[PDB]
Write an enzyme that holds these catalytic residues in place. Structure first.
Site, PDB file in Angstrom:
ATOM      1  N   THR A   1      33.177   4.344   5.509  1.00 35.04           N
ATOM      2  CA  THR A   1      32.109   3.756   6.705  1.00 35.04           C
ATOM      3  C   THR A   1      31.512   4.733   7.487  1.00 35.04           C
ATOM      4  O   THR A   1      30.530   4.583   7.904  1.00 35.04           O
ATOM      5  CB  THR A   1      33.113   2.683   7.416  1.00 35.04           C
ATOM      6  OG1 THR A   1      34.003   1.955   6.629  1.00 35.04           O
ATOM      7  CG2 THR A   1      32.251   1.654   8.283  1.00 35.04           C
ATOM      8  N   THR A   2      31.977   5.891   8.038  1.00 35.74           N
ATOM      9  CA  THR A   2      31.563   6.821   8.479  1.00 35.74           C
ATOM     10  C   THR A   2      30.561   7.645   7.879  1.00 35.74           C
ATOM     11  O   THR A   2      29.620   8.141   8.523  1.00 35.74           O
ATOM     12  CB  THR A   2      32.767   7.599   9.232  1.00 35.74           C
ATOM     13  OG1 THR A   2      33.587   7.999   8.476  1.00 35.74           O
ATOM     14  CG2 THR A   2      33.208   6.836  10.357  1.00 35.74           C
TER      15      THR A   2
ATOM     16  N   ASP B   1      42.426  -0.060   4.765  1.00 36.04           N
ATOM     17  CA  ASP B   1      41.605   0.826   4.308  1.00 36.04           C
ATOM     18  C   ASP B   1      42.359   1.263   2.949  1.00 36.04           C
ATOM     19  O   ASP B   1      41.766   1.392   1.949  1.00 36.04           O
ATOM     20  CB  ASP B   1      41.249   2.034   5.142  1.00 36.04           C
ATOM     21  CG  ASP B   1      39.998   1.662   6.049  1.00 36.04           C
ATOM     22  OD1 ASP B   1      39.578   0.415   6.206  1.00 36.04           O
ATOM     23  OD2 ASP B   1      39.604   2.373   6.497  1.00 36.04           O
TER      24      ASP B   1
ATOM     25  N   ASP C   1      38.439   3.773  12.417  1.00 32.94           N
ATOM     26  CA  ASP C   1      37.509   3.165  11.466  1.00 32.94           C
ATOM     27  C   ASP C   1      36.015   3.181  12.088  1.00 32.94           C
ATOM     28  O   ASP C   1      36.027   2.675  13.135  1.00 32.94           O
ATOM     29  CB  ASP C   1      37.869   1.811  11.116  1.00 32.94           C
ATOM     30  CG  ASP C   1      37.337   1.128   9.997  1.00 32.94           C
ATOM     31  OD1 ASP C   1      37.551   1.662   8.692  1.00 32.94           O
ATOM     32  OD2 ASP C   1      36.391   0.082  10.324  1.00 32.94           O
TER      33      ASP C   1
HETATM   34  N1  LIG Z   1      43.549  15.732   2.678  1.00 36.28           N
HETATM   35  C1  LIG Z   1      42.042  16.000   2.417  1.00 36.28           C
HETATM   36  N2  LIG Z   1      41.747  17.277   2.542  1.00 36.28           N
HETATM   37  C2  LIG Z   1      40.274  17.362   2.466  1.00 36.28           C
HETATM   38  N3  LIG Z   1      39.406  16.410   2.694  1.00 36.28           N
HETATM   39  C3  LIG Z   1      39.937  15.085   3.112  1.00 36.28           C
HETATM   40  C4  LIG Z   1      41.243  14.936   2.813  1.00 36.28           C
HETATM   41  N4  LIG Z   1      41.294  13.519   3.118  1.00 36.28           N
HETATM   42  C5  LIG Z   1      40.077  12.821   3.133  1.00 36.28           C
HETATM   43  N5  LIG Z   1      39.191  14.069   3.481  1.00 36.28           N
HETATM   44  C6  LIG Z   1      37.536  13.886   3.485  1.00 36.28           C
HETATM   45  O1  LIG Z   1      37.288  13.168   4.653  1.00 36.28           O
HETATM   46  C7  LIG Z   1      36.348  12.359   4.530  1.00 36.28           C
HETATM   47  C8  LIG Z   1      36.269  11.260   5.575  1.00 36.28           C
HETATM   48  O2  LIG Z   1      37.036  10.213   5.301  1.00 36.28           O
HETATM   49  P1  LIG Z   1      37.077   9.263   6.529  1.00 36.28           P
HETATM   50  O3  LIG Z   1      36.107   9.539   7.566  1.00 36.28           O
HETATM   51  O4  LIG Z   1      38.775   9.287   6.804  1.00 36.28           O
HETATM   52  O5  LIG Z   1      36.517   7.670   5.718  1.00 36.28           O
HETATM   53  P2  LIG Z   1      35.792   6.738   6.579  1.00 36.28           P
HETATM   54  O6  LIG Z   1      34.447   7.478   6.424  1.00 36.28           O
HETATM   55  O7  LIG Z   1      35.971   5.579   5.848  1.00 36.28           O
HETATM   56  O8  LIG Z   1      36.408   6.635   7.814  1.00 36.28           O
HETATM   57  C9  LIG Z   1      36.239  11.857   3.466  1.00 36.28           C
HETATM   58  O9  LIG Z   1      34.924  11.830   2.826  1.00 36.28           O
HETATM   59  C10 LIG Z   1      37.232  12.788   2.408  1.00 36.28           C
HETATM   60  O10 LIG Z   1      36.692  13.346   1.345  1.00 36.28           O
HETATM   61 MG   LIG Z   2      38.279   6.724   4.696  1.00 37.15          MG
END
Ligand SMILES: Nc1ncnc2c1ncn2[C@@H]1O[C@H](COP(=O)(O)OP(=O)(O)O)[C@@H](O)[C@H]1O
Ligand SMILES: [Mg+2]
Ligand SMILES: Nc1ncnc2c1ncn2[C@@H]1O[C@H](COP(=O)(O)OP(=O)(O)O)[C@@H](O)[C@H]1O
Ligand SMILES: [Mg+2]
Lengths: 526, 532, 54, 49
Positions: free
Chosen positions: B87-88, B391, B54
Site C-alpha cells: 500500500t505504501t 496483511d 499500514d
Molecule cells: N526482510 C526483508 N529484506 C529486505 N527487504 C524487505 C524485507 N521485507 C520486506 N522488504 C521490502 O520492504 C518493502 C516495504 O514493504 P511494506 O512497506 O512492509 O509493505 P506495504 O507497502 O504494504 O506497507 C517491500 O517492497 C519489500 O520488498
Molecule cells: Mg507490506
C-alpha cells in the site's frame, strides 16, 4: 485563499523529538507512582472529578484516576489496566519496569543505533527472562493452608490492610476456596461474579467476615412475614407476581353489566392461581427479581411464606449458587429440584438504620458475600481493593502452583543470569541486552529508596551476593533495609504475576520504541 | 472577463501544486517502508490513539483537502482492497512518477508523449516481470509460504515474532481452504475470525482449531461446557409471541383472555420443545432470547446464545454442517424441526481470556474452520497486530492462489529500471525520455529502503544497479536477478536465496494503479475552484 | 418512603462503575436520530464543574 | 567518560559510527599511541596519527 494539502488543524511531528518525548512521558508516568511500591509505601489522595475522594496506593487506581494528553502516557495507563485485569497485582512494578527499560533504550537511541536492533535485543532478553523465571521457581502444595495464608500475607504486606493480616488472609482464602466450582469437566473460580464484597460503614474492621452464604440489602414485603426461619426452602423467580398487560393489543369490548366485575375477579383468580402454583412446592422463602403484588403477598402469607421482591439479577444468581437453587420464570413449571434446600438459616436483621437480609448458614455454598465494617467509605473502598488483590493472588496460586522469591531477589537473579548469558553474544546487540537485563535492578533500588537506606551500597552488596552460586533467593528487607534471604523472610510471589509483569513491561518498551512520527488534530471521520 | 465566482490556476502553477500535494502525501508515509521502517502514532483530537504502519490506514485516518492528494489516498485504499499488500509502495511510486513526469513537462515535453511513454513502460515492465522475474512456488513448498508471510510481517509489530506468526498464519489459511467449480483452490480469507484481548505476550496468541465467538451464554444457570455439541443455528428471536400490525385482539367474552395470554407464550414454549426434542445441545440465534426460553434451556442443560453476529453464525453453520433456520416451517404447512438441521462439533467451551469470557467451538466436523486470538499488552498493540496479521493472511492467499512470487528488497525495481533504461532507446524520441524517466522513478523503492536504515543509499543502489546490469548483459550470469538489498548489514544479497519473497500480483497491480494515477493527475493543466 | 428516592443510592453506586464555527458544523452534519446535549459554561463562575462531572 | 563526547561528536558530524571509532581509539591508545585520533577523510570508521 488558504490552499492546503492536509487540514488546518493537523499537526505533524517526527524525528528524534518524538522518541525523546515518548520516553520522557513514560518516565514521568513512572515517576508519578514510583514512591507507592513496597511495604513502606505512602498513601495518595486522588480528587475524583465527580467530587469523590480516592485514597489509595495501588498503582492501577492512581494511574486510572489521572487524565493525560500525551499518547504515550495513555499507552502506559492502558498497560497498567491490562496488568491489573490479567493478574490483579504488579501494576506499580510493571509501570516502573517499563519506564526503566524505556530509559535504557533512550540511552542507545541517542547514539546511532536503529530502534529495530534495540527491539530485537529486548525480545531476546524477554525470552531469557521467562526462561530464568521458570528456572528459579519452586512448587507449592495447595492443600497446605499455612502456605496459602503465607502467600496471601506476602501479597498484602504492602497495603493498608497489613495491620490486620491474619483476618484478611483468612477471609480471602475462604472466599476463593468456597467460590471454587467444577461442572461438566470445567473448572472455574469466578471471583468477579460471585464472592461479592459488601461494605457497611461503621463498626470495627475486626468484625469483617465472609459469610457461608449471601447477604442483600432487602426487607420482607409485608411485616407479618417471618424475619427468622430455621431451615428455609428458597424458591427464586424472575417473572412478576402481578397482573401485567399482554404483548399484543388486546382491547376488550364490554356490553354486559357483569363483564367488568368478572374481569376484575379473573385478575384476582389469576393471581391466586400463580400463588397456589408457588405454594404447591411448600417453600418458606420466595425471591423475585421483579415486583410482587399485594394480593400475591396476602396469598403467600396465608401459606406462611416470606417474600422478597425487586432483587438484582446478579444477587439472585449469587443466592442460587449459595443455597443450591435454580431460578424459574414460570411457577407452573416449578420442579422439586428447583427448590433451594441447603441454606441453614435465613435472618432479617437491622444494621444501623437499614434492614439487611442474611442467608448465612448454607452447607457447601458456591457463592459468598464479604461483609466489611470500617471507619468510612474511603477506608472500606481501600480495604475492598486490598481484598481483591489478595483474592486475585490466591486464584493465581491455585491455578498455577509455582512461586518466585520476592523483595527484588527474582529481579537480581534474572539480571545476573542474563548478564552471564550476554558474555557469549559477541555482537552489536549485546549492549541493549545487558542494559535491559540490568534495568531489572530498579525494583530493589525502588524498595531501598522507599525504605530509606543507602541505595548504592545496598545494590552493590546485593549484586555481589547474587554473583555467588546459591543466592537467587537473596533480596532486600523492605522494613529494615538489610540483605536477607526470602527463604527466611518468607516473601514469595506467584510465578504468573512476575511473568505477566516482565512480559508487559518488555512489550510496552517494544511498542513505544517503534514510533518515530506523530500526527494529530485530524477529525474522527466516523 | 471570465466573471466566474472562484479561483483559477493555469499552466505550470497548477501542475507544480499537484506535484507538491502528491509529494507531501508520499513524504507522510515514506518513513514507514521496509523492515527498518518505523510506525506512526495518530491522535484523533478526542484522545483516540492509533499506532500503525499500514499505509492505507494512515491515509484513511488523515483528512486531506487537496484533490490530487485524495487521488493518491484512494489509490492506496484501492491497492489495499484489491491486493492487501504494497500500500505504501504504490503511493510512493505514483508520487515519484508524477514528479519526474512534471520535470519532463517543465522541460517543454508535451504531456501526451509522457503519458504514452509511461503506458509503454508499464506494459513492458509487466511483461518483463512475468517473463524473467517470477519463481514458481511448486518446487519450493511450505517454505515459500512461510518466507512470504515472514517478509510480509517484517516492518510490523510482529517482526521478530515472525518465526511463530508465519506458522500460525499459514496454518490458519490452509485450514479454510476449499475448492469451487472448475477445481480451483480458492482461499476465502476474512473467514478467519480475528479476536483480540490484551494480557499475555504475543507468543501466547492462540490459533483455534475451530471457531471463536465473542459472546457468552445468556444465563448463568446453563452449563459452560458441552462435550458432544449438537449446534442448532437459528435466525429468529425466541421471545413471547406478539401479533403483527394486521392482527388485533378484541375480547367480547371475558372467559377467553386467560387462554389468549397463555397461548402467547405457549407458542414459543412449543417451538423450544420442538427444537430440543432432537437432541440439540448448543442453540445459537441472531435474535434475542427472553428469560422464559433461557429458563427452558437451563432446565434441559443446554447452551443458548443470543445476539450472535450474522457472519459468525453463517461461518459456524457452514463449518459444523448446520443449516440456518429463519423460521420453523416445512413444505407441508406444519411447524417442525428435524435432526438433519443440527451441526456437530467435538467440544463447545466458554473459556476465560483476561477477566472476560468467550465461547470456543472446537473441531467442527464436515468442515474445518479457524480463528486467531491475539494477545497483547494494550488495545493499540492488539489493533496493530490485527492489521499486520490481515496483511500476512492476504499475502499468503495471493501466493497460494497464483503460484508465482518475485524477489523482494527492491531487486525487481532495480531489474526493471535497468531493463527499461536499455529498452527506451528502441522506441520513439520523446517517449524515449518518458520511458527513461519511468525507469528512474522505479528506483525510489530501494532508495527509500536504504535511507530508512541510515545506510549509504547512493552506493548501495549503485552496486545493485551494477549487479543487475551485469545480469542483463551477460547471459551466463542470470542468477544475479535475485540480488536485492539486505538492510540488516547494508549489502547486496541474493534475496531468493535469503527467502525474501512477494507475490507477483502485488508488483503488477501496484505498477498498473500507480501508472493510472500518474496519468490521471498529469492530464490536468488548469483548475477552477468555485467559491462555496 | 418514595419521596427519598431509595434507588438514588444504588444508581449512584452503579454510576461510578465506569468499567464558533464548530458549533454550527458539528450539528449541521451527522445523523439527526441521535441526541446531542450541548453544554454552556464560563470559567470562574461556580456551578459549572458539578454539572460537567455529572 | 565525559571526554568521549568529543570524538563521538566528531564521528557523528563526519557521518560514521561513533562506537566503532571510540573502540578503535581505545584499542590504539592501549597499544601505546597517544597521538592517534579520528580521520574524517574516510567513508568508514578509521583513525590515523
Ligand atoms: N526482510 C526483508 N529484506 C529486505 N527487504 C524487505 C524485507 N521485507 C520486506 N522488504 C521490502 O520492504 C518493502 C516495504 O514493504 P511494506 O512497506 O512492509 O509493505 P506495504 O507497502 O504494504 O506497507 C517491500 O517492497 C519489500 O520488498
Ligand atoms: Mg507490506
Ligand atoms: N516484607 C517485604 N520485604 C521486602 N520486600 C517486599 C516485602 N513485601 C513485598 N515486597 C516487595 O514489594 C513489591 C510489591 O509492591 P506492591 O506495592 O505490591 O506493588 P504492586 O501493587 O505493583 O504489586 C514486590 O516486588 C515485593 O518483592
Ligand atoms: Mg501488590
Amino acid at each position: 485563499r488558504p490552499v492546503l494539502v492536509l487540514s488546518q488543524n493537523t499537526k505533524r511531528e517526527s524525528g528524534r523529538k518524538v522518541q525523546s518525548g515518548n520516553i520522557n512521558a513514560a518516565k514521568t508516568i513512572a515517576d508519578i507512582i514510583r514512591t507507592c511500591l513496597g511495604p513502606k509505601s505512602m498513601m495518595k489522595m486522588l480528587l475524583d472529578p465527580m467530587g469523590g475522594i480516592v485514597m489509595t496506593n495501588d498503582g492501577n487506581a492512581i494511574l486510572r484516576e489521572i487524565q493525560v494528553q500525551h499518547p504515550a502516557a495513555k499507552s502506559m495507563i492502558e498497560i497498567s489496566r491490562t496488568q491489573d485485569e490479567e493478574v490483579g497485582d504488579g501494576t506499580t512494578s510493571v509501570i516502573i519496569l517499563a519506564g526503566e527499560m524505556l530509559s535504557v533504550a533512550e540511552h542507545f537511541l541517542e547514539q546511532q543505533m536503529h530502534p529495530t536492533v534495540v527491539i530485537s535485543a529486548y525480545r531476546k532478553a524477554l525470552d531469557d527472562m521467562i526462561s530464568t523465571l521458570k528456572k528459579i521457581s519452586i512448587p507449592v502444595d495447595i492443600s497446605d493452608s499455612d502456605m496459602m495464608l503465607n502467600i496471601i500475607n506476602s501479597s498484602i504486606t504492602t497495603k493498608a490492610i497489613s495491620r490486620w493480616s491474619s483476618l484478611a488472609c483468612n477471609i480471602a482464602l475462604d472466599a476463593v476456596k468456597m467460590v471454587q466450582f467444577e461442572e461438566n469437566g470445567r473448572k472455574e473460580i469466578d471471583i468477579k461474579k460471585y464472592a461479592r464484597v459488601e461494605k457497611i460503614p461503621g463498626g470495627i474492621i475486626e468484625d469483617s467476615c465472609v459469610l457461608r452464604g449471601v447477604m442483600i440489602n432487602k426487607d420482607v414485603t409485608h411485616p407479618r412475614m417471618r424475619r427468622y426461619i430455621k431451615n428455609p426452602r428458597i424458591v427464586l423467580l424472575d417473572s412478576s407476581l402481578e397482573y401485567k398487560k399482554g404483548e399484543s393489543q388486546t382491547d376488550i369490548e364490554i356490553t354486559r353489566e357483569e363483564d367488568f366485575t368478572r374481569i376484575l375477579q379473573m385478575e384476582e383468580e389469576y393471581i391466586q392461581q400463580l400463588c397456589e402454583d408457588i405454594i404447591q412446592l411448600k417453600p418458606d422463602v420466595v425471591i423475585t427479581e421483579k415486583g410482587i403484588s399485594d394480593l400475591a403477598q396476602h396469598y403467600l402469607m396465608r401459606a406462611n411464606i416470606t417474600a422478597i421482591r425487586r432483587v438484582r439479577k446478579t444477587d439472585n444468581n449469587r443466592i442460587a449458587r449459595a443455597c443450591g437453587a435454580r431460578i424459574v420464570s414460570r411457577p407452573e413449571e416449578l420442579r422439586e429440584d428447583d427448590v433451594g434446600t441447603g441454606a441453614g438459616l435465613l435472618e432479617i436483621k437491622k444494621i444501623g438504620d437499614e434492614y439487611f437480609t442474611f442467608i448465612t448458614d448454607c452447607k457447601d455454598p458456591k457463592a459468598c458475600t464479604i461483609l466489611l465494617r470500617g471507619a468510612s467509605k474511603e477506608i472500606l473502598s481501600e480495604v475492598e481493593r486490598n481484598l481483591q488483590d489478595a483474592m486475585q493472588v490466591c486464584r493465581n496460586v491455585l491455578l498455577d502452583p509455582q512461586l518466585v522469591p520476592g523483595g527484588g531477589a527474582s529481579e537480581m537473579a534474572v539480571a545476573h543470569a542474563l548478564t552471564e548469558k550476554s558474555k557469549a553474544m559477541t555482537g552489536v546487540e549485546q549492549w541493549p541486552y545487558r542494559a535491559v537485563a540490568q534495568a531489572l535492578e530498579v525494583i530493589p533500588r525502588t524498595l531501598i529508596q522507599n525504605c530509606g537506606a543507602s541505595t548504592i551500597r545496598l545494590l552493590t552488596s546485593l549484586r555481589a551476593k547474587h554473583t555467588q552460586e546459591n543466592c537467587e533467593t537473596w533480596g532486600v528487607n523492605g522494613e529494615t533495609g538489610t540483605l536477607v534471604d526470602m527463604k527466611e523472610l518468607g516473601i514469595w510471589e506467584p510465578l504468573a504475576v512476575k511473568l505477566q509483569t516482565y512480559k508487559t513491561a518488555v512489550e510496552t518498551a517494544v511498542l513505544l520504541l517503534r514510533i518515530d512520527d506523530i500526527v494529530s488534530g485530524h477529525k474522527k471521520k466516523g | 472577463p471570465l466573471s466566474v465566482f472562484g479561483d483559477r490556476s493555469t499552466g505550470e502553477t497548477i501542475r507544480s501544486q499537484n506535484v507538491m500535494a502528491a509529494a507531501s502525501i508520499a513524504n507522510i508515509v515514506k518513513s514507514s517502508l521496509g523492515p527498518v521502517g518505523l510506525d506512526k502514532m495518530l491522535v484523533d483530537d478526542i484522545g483516540d490513539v492509533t499506532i500503525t504502519n499500514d499505509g492505507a490506514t494512515i491515509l484513511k485516518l488523515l483528512e486531506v483537502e487537496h484533490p490530487a492528494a485524495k487521488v493518491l489516498c484512494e489509490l492506496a485504499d484501492l491497492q489495499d482492497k484489491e491486493v492487501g499488500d504494497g500500500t505504501t509502495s504504490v503511493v510512493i511510486i505514483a508520487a515519484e512518477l508524477l514528479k519526474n513526469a512534471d520535470e519532463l513537462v517543465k522541460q517543454k515535453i508535451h504531456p501526451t508523449s509522457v503519458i504514452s511513454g509511461y503506458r509503454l513502460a508499464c506494459k513492458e515492465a509487466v511483461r518483463y516481470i512475468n517473463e524473467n522475474l517470477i519463481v514458481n512456488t511448486d518446487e519450493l513448498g511450505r517454505d515459500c509460504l512461510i518466507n512470504a508471510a515472514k517478509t510480509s510481517m517484517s516492518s510490523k509489530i510482529i517482526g521478530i515474532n515472525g518465526d511463530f506468526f508465519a506458522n500460525m498464519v499459514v496454518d490458519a489459511v490452509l485450514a479454510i481452504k476449499y475448492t469451487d467449480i472448475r477445481g480451483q483452490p480458492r482461499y476465502p480469507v476474512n473467514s478467519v475470525n480475528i479476536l483480540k484481548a490484551h494480557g499475555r505476550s504475543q507468543m501466547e496468541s492462540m490459533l483455534i482449531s475451530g471457531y471463536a465467538l465473542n459472546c457468552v451464554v445468556g444465563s448463568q444457570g446453563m452449563p459452560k461446557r458441552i462435550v458432544n455439541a449438537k449446534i442448532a443455528c437459528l435466525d429468529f428471536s425466541l421471545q413471547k409471541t406478539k401479533m403483527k400490525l394486521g392482527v388485533q385482539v378484541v375480547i367480547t367474552d371475558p372467559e377467553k383472555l386467560d387462554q389468549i395470554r397463555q397461548r402467547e407464550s405457549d407458542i414459543t414454549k412449543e417451538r423450544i420443545q420442538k427444537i430440543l426434542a432432537t437432541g440439540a445441545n448448543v442453540i445459537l440465534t441472531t435474535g434475542g432470547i427472553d428469560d422464559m426460553c433461557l429458563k427452558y434451556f437451563v432446565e434441559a442443560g443446554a447452551m443458548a446464545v443470543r445476539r450472535v453476529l450474522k457472519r459468525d453464525l453463517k461461518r459456524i453453520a457452514k463449518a459444523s454442517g448446520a443449516t440456518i433456520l429463519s423460521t420453523l416451517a416445512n413444505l407441508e404447512g406444519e411447524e417442525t424441526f428435524e435432526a438433519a438441521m443440527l451441526g456437530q462439533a467435538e467440544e463447545v467451551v466458554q473459556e476465560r481470556i483476561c477477566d472476560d469470557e468467550l465461547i470456543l467451538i472446537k473441531n467442527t466436523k464436515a468442515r474445518t474452520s479457524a480463528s486467531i486470538i491475539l494477545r497483547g499488552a494494550n488495545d493499540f498493540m492488539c489493533d496493530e497486530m490485527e492489521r499486520s496479521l490481515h496483511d500476512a493472511l492476504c499475502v499468503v492467499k495471493r501466493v497460494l492462489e497464483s503460484k508465482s512470487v518475485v524477489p523482494g528488497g527492491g531487486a525487481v525495481e532495480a531489474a526493471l529500471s535497468i531493463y527499461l533504461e536499455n529498452y527506451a532507446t528502441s522506441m520513439g524520441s520523446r517517449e524515449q525520455l518518458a520511458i527513461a524517466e519511468f525507469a528512474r522513478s522505479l528506483l525510489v523503492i530501494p532508495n527509500t529502503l536504504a535511507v530508512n536504515a541510515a545506510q549509504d543509499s547512493t552506493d548501495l543502489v549503485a552496486k545493485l544497479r551494477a549487479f543487475h546490469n551485469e545480469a542483463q548483459v551477460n547471459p551466463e550470469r542470470k542468477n544475479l536477478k535475485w540480488i536485492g538489498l539486505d538492510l540488516s548489514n547494508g549489502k547486496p544479497r541474493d534475496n531468493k536465496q535469503a527467502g525474501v519473497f512477494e507475490p507477483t500480483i502485488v508488483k503488477v497491480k501496484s505498477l498498473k494503479f500507480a501508472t493510472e494515477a500518474a496519468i490521471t493527475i498529469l492530464r490536468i493543466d488548469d483548475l477552477i475552484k468555485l467559491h462555496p | 418512603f418514595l419521596q427519598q428516592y431509595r434507588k438514588q443510592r444504588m444508581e449512584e453506586m452503579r454510576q461510578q462503575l465506569h468499567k464558533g464555527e464548530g458549533f454550527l458544523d458539528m450539528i449541521d452534519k451527522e445523523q439527526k436520530s441521535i441526541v446531542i446535549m450541548v453544554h454552556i459554561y464560563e470559567d470562574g463562575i461556580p456551578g459549572t464543574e458539578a454539572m460537567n462531572g455529572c | 567518560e565525559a571526554f568521549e563526547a568529543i570524538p563521538r561528536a566528531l564521528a557523528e558530524n563526519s557521518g560514521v559510527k561513533a562506537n566503532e571509532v571510540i573502540s578503535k581509539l581505545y584499542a590504539v591508545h592501549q597499544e601505546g599511541n597517544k597521538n592517534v585520533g579520528l580521520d574524517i577523510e574516510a567513508e568508514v570508521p578509521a583513525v590515523k596519527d
